[PDB]
Amino acid sequence: HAVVIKKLNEILQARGKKGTDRAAQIELLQLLVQIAAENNLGEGVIVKIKFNIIASLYDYNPNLATYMKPEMWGKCLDCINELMDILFANPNIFVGENILEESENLHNADQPLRVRGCILTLVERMDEEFTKIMQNTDPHSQEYVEHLKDEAQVCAIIERVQRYLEEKGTTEEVCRIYLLRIL
Helix, strand or coil: CHHHHHHHHHHHHHHCCCCCCHHHHHHHHHHHHHCCCCCCCCHHHHHHHHHHHHHHHHHHHHHCCCCCCHHHHHHHHHHHHHHHHHHHHCCCCCCCCCCCCCCCCCCCCCCHHHHHCHHHHHHHHHHHHHHHHHHHCCCCCHHHHHHHHHHHHHHHHHHHHHHHHHHCCCCCHHHHHHHHHHC
16 A cells, blocks of 8 residues: 555656656556556556556657657557556446545545546547657658558547546546547
8 A cells, every 4th residue: 555655646746857768667557557466456456557557658759759669559549548548447446436426525626527527638649649640750761651540549539538528427428539530
């Protein structure tokens, strides 16, 4: 428990500091993420780990001069799909239903879009960066064709994410992934 929380929080705080090695920050999250240790084990730990893991990857690329790598795009997709699989295996039971999501706290405020809306944005990044590759590659090279092979895999996540939102779905979820789906 407290080991996990303190680790994760120390990491998040450290991330908000200018000089950071992003490679090591990612690798640490991953080593941290598995939680082989019994205290580490648990679904909230997994979800709250991934939630800060995905943008942790996306952010590192932005700081560095722009480049397109097939491998880099691929593994973050794996991350998002794993979070989605965990949430799917959850069956909308992580919130302790509806009447009480969790034991009440006066300080705490909970919004479904607020915590669970962020998910969509992740997907969107996957798409946007992906587009940035198709622009930056050579039009007639085979690499372009391979990237266009990745397009389908993005569409997959759009639909899947849409469906999870419908099962636990909240209003205005449809408007953006419907748009991407159209595009």
